[PDB]
Curated annotation (Swiss-Prot), chain A:
GO terms for molecular function: structural constituent of ribosome. Component of the small ribosomal subunit. The ribosome is a large ribonucleoprotein complex responsible for the synthesis of proteins in the cell. This is Small ribosomal subunit protein eS21. GO terms for cellular component: cytosolic ribosome; ribonucleoprotein complex; rough endoplasmic reticulum.
UniProtKB/Swiss-Prot annotation, chain B:
Ubiquitinated at Lys-103 by RNF14 and RNF25 in response to ribosome collisions (ribosome stalling). PROSITE patterns: RIBOSOMAL_S17E. This is Small ribosomal subunit protein eS17. It holds the Pfam family Ribosomal_S17e. The modification Phosphoserine is found at residue 113. The gene is RPS17.
From Swiss-Prot, chain C:
The modification N6-acetyllysine is found at residues 51, 88. Residues 160-179 are annotated as: Laminin-binding. It comes from Oryctolagus cuniculus. The modification N-acetylserine is found at residue 1. The chain holds residues 2 to 209 of 295 of the full protein. Keywords: Acetylation, Cell membrane, Cytoplasm, Host cell receptor for virus entry, Host-virus interaction, Isopeptide bond, Membrane, Nucleus, Phosphoprotein, Receptor, Repeat, Ribonucleoprotein, Ribosomal protein, Ubl conjugation. This is Small ribosomal subunit protein uS2.
Swiss-Prot record, chain D:
It comes from Oryctolagus cuniculus (Rabbit). Keywords: Cytoplasm, Nucleus, Ribonucleoprotein, Ribosomal protein. SUPFAM superfamilies: Ribosomal protein S8. PROSITE patterns: RIBOSOMAL_S8. InterPro entries: Ribosomal_uS8, Ribosomal_uS8_CS, Ribosomal_uS8_sf. One of its GO terms (biological process) is translation. Component of the small ribosomal subunit. Part of the small subunit (SSU) processome, first precursor of the small eukaryotic ribosomal subunit. During the assembly of the SSU processome in the nucleolus, many ribosome biogenesis factors, an RNA chaperone and ribosomal proteins associate with the nascent pre-rRNA and work in concert to generate RNA folding, modifications, rearrangements and cleavage as well as targeted degradation of pre-ribosomal RNA by the RNA exosome. Required for proper erythropoiesis. This is Small ribosomal subunit protein uS8.
Length: 82, 126, 208, 129, 226
């Protein structure tokens, strides 16, 4: 957040979950980052740079996260036509 | 009557059988004198109890495995059951066929072998 | 799948799926399990798609790879069928098994001596191991498990459908799970027969 | 009955956004709802929206994001005279800095920030933030 | 005579990374929304700006066949004047032990606040970003933003918390039974929490999802550490 100078304030800028577009607080212990491993996709062997996600507790606790994690990987890979 | 054994007996009885399994007999008097040497029990009457329960446990340990304490040879036979069972080496009998509506899935996923057909009657409980 | 046919399901594995009856799934359904099913028979039994099973296997396994420590991907199962299977899993691949009764408080205590902080979980059957799932949402653990048609989804991030009512469906699936993580991380890769088989991930099954 | 159409409309998109959705169905499609959502789209609280056509009155479908917190209606429709304005916007907005009271004027439907630059009072409809 | 402390050997993973000093601020922790399970982590980062303000020391007591039995339940506030506050309750047989139990618990539950401006900028935020609420069982508060130099206009109870928060200007109003102050202060604390859980147009740009400290610093923790 900006000021007169454009100087940035706020002690931490919180992170905003992928499929809910809302922000998770300092205490919120049902919110998970989930690391998918990429592969080279020529031999199907692990190669470094991961795809990382974040999900909030609200969609987790109702049981909607399973669709969200699927759709996120469906707009990328690995998922073709499921 | 009464005289149900306390936890102080049952705690140390298990321990003494685990670490001195070999020394045990199945006679009262021999199992007493062993407990006297491998440990000190500060009373005499207490000693006569802990021996008798050590004896009574050792009867059952020569059958199937006790669920309160472990010995070595049971963990041997555990491992022997849990690394191969004589029932199969084949997966599962190598060829198993399935009935239609499973065949339709396989048709649309490029598979077309090793099937049977039976079109079993309607319906649930009927 | 992703890569064109060097990750896609082979003709071989199809036989194993059908021989272990994984395709079959129970009578009762949930509204989160509607898409995974294709259809019903003429009888009460609903036929899970095996293509849809296969895609979910991969990113599930790829997440088990993505951690840089294999000693803190804690697997859990408490059903008798799922005891022998998980024990070989976490013996072969570096992982931590928690076999039998969970003994609650082991993801939130500072006094218990079985206290652990893992990152992932891999659970068999939500409705036998509901306890670790509830405690996972107090300390930010990602979660994976094996769902059936009638198993509800709640405090799980990804499902891996299966028949799993106590069958060869169980042990086969845990074997396949351990096969994939080695194709990416390990040197077992070649994708042509591995020495270890699914004939010892199956149930103890009391002998003669 | 359905005395006021716009008032029944906003509660759906309010309820839907809370549960976590991104497509809705709102009926029965008034022209008043269209120009409302047009202004609400420019600022960026919702995405593009598709008007289905029927002879009856139509139906509208919306694509939305979590940026919206709540859009409400204010009924019945009171007048504003550009000195009453400051009193309204204090009660109805979380802050001076952002939030947008909407209204209709003879110069068309618009936010309050625009109306002040045209010197036009008029009848207030709702709000959002 | 004899010298040297040795205090705080971590049994917690997060605690060990702080003790080896590869986590450089609490602001990293909050960004991943981790629990904090030890009271020395916070007291390592801070500890020379944290004050305590014991609100009430309240008796409660039940009835048994031998008569009364009374335990003392005290509330204790905590906060430095840069944006971090907390609050805690605890009860025990005696007084001092309950107080010291609460001074530990309040450090554990500490959180940051988000401060903002009135309608214009001149640097250094002095008030609350947006108009928020917070309820605890029929008590609620309506923290309303205020211009500079008005001071905190509130009852005595929330005037403690908001002043420690560094929120120097605020208008408030209460609703319901504020006599039972345990509700009243927990409802204030509830409101003060919501400040970073309220979405504003500033935060609409998308996050970069930087990798976790748990992931990057895992190399030191492959010895026997848990």
């Amino acid at each position: 957040m900006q000021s007169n100078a454009g100087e940035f304030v706020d002690l931490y800028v919180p992170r905003k979950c992928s499929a809910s577009n809302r922000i998770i607080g300092a205490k919120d212990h049902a919110s998970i980052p989930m690391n998918v491993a990429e592969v080279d996709k020529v031999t199907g062997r692990f190669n470094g740079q991961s795809k990382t996600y974040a999900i909030c507790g609200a969609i987790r606790r109702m049981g909607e996260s399973d669709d969200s994690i699927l759709r996120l990987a469906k707009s990328h890979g690995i998922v073709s036509q499921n | 009557m009464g005289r149900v054994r306390t936890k102080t007996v049952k705690k140390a009885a298990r321990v003494i059988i685990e670490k001195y399994y070999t020394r045990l007999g199945n006679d009262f008097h021999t199992n007493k004198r062993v407990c006297e040497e491998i440990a000190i029990i500060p009373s005499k009457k207490l000693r006569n109890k802990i021996a008798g329960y050590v004896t009574h446990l050792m009867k059952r340990i020569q059958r199937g495995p006790v669920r309160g304490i472990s010995i070595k040879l049971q963990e041997e036979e555990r491992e022997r059951r849990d690394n191969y069972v004589p029932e199969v080496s084949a997966l599962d009998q190598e060829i198993i066929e399935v009935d239609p509506d499973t065949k339709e899935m396989l048709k649309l996923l490029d598979f077309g072998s090793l099937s049977n057909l039976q079109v079993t009657q309607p319906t649930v409980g009927m | 799948s992703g890569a064109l046919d060097v990750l896609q399901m082979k003709e071989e594995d199809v036989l194993k799926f059908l021989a272990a009856g994984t395709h079959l799934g129970g009578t009762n359904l949930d509204f989160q399990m509607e898409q995974y099913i294709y259809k019903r028979k003429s009888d009460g039994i609903y036929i899970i798609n095996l293509k849809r099973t296969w895609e979910k296997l991969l990113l599930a396994a790829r997440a088990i790879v993505a951690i840089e420590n294999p000693a803190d991907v804690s697997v859990i199962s408490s059903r008798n069928t799922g005891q022998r299977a998980v024990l070989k899993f976490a013996a072969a691949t570096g992982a931590t098994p928690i076999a039998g009764r969970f003994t609650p408080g082991t993801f939130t205590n500072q006094i218990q001596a079985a206290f652990r902080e893992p990152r992932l979980l891999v659970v068999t059957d939500p409705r036998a191991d509901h306890q670790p799932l509830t405690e996972a949402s107090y300390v930010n653990l990602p979660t994976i498990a094996l769902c059936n048609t009638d198993s509800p989804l709640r405090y799980v991030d990804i499902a891996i459908p299966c028949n799993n009512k106590g069958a060869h469906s169980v042990g086969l699936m845990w074997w396949m799970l351990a096969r994939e993580v080695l194709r990416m991380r390990g040197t077992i890769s070649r994708e042509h027969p591995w020495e270890v088989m699914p004939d010892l991930y199956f149930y103890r099954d009391p002998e003669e | 009955v359905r005395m006021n159409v716009l008032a029944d409309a906003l509660k759906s998109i309010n309820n839907a956004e809370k549960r976590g959705k991104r497509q809705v169905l709102i009926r029965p499609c008034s022209k008043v709802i269209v120009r409302f959502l047009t202004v609400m789209m420019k600022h960026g609280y919702i995405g593009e929206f598709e008007i289905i056509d029927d002879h009856r009155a139509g139906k509208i479908v919306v694509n939305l994001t979590g940026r919206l917190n709540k859009c409400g209606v204010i009924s019945p429709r009171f007048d504003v005279q550009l000195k009453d304005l400051e009193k309204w916007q204090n009660n109805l907005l979380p802050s001076r800095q952002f939030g947008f009271i909407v209204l209709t004027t003879s110069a068309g439907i618009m936010d309050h920030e625009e109306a002040r630059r045209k010197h036009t009072g008029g009848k207030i409809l709702g709000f959002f933030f | 005579g004899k010298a040297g402390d040795k205090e705080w050997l971590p049994v917690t993973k997060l605690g060990r990374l702080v003790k080896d000093m590869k986590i450089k601020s609490l602001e990293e922790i909050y960004l991943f929304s981790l629990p904090i399970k030890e009271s020395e982590i916070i007291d390592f980062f801070l500890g020379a700006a944290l004050k305590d303000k014991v609100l009430k020391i309240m008796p409660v007591q039940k009835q048994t066949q031998a008569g009364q039995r009374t335990r003392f339940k005290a509330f204790v506030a905590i906060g430095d004047y840069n944006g971090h506050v907390g609050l805690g309750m605890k009860c025990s047989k005696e007084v001092a032990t309950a107080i010291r139990g609460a001074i530990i618990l309040a450090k554990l539950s500490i959180v940051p606040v988000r401060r903002g401006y009135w309608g214009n900028k001149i640097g250094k935020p002095h008030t609350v970003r947006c108009k928020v609420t917070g309820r605890c069982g029929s008590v609620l508060v309506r923290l309303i933003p205020a211009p500079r130099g008005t001071g905190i206009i509130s009852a005595p109870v929330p005037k403690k918390l908001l002043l420690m928060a560094g929120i120097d200007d605020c208008y408030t109003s209460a609703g319901g039974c504020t006599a039972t102050l345990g509700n009243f202060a927990k409802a204030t604390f509830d409101a003060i929490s919501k400040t970073y859980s309220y979405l504003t147009p500033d935060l609409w740009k998308e996050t970069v999802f930087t990798k976790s400290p748990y992931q990057e610093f895992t190399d030191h923790l492959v010895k026997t550490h848990t």
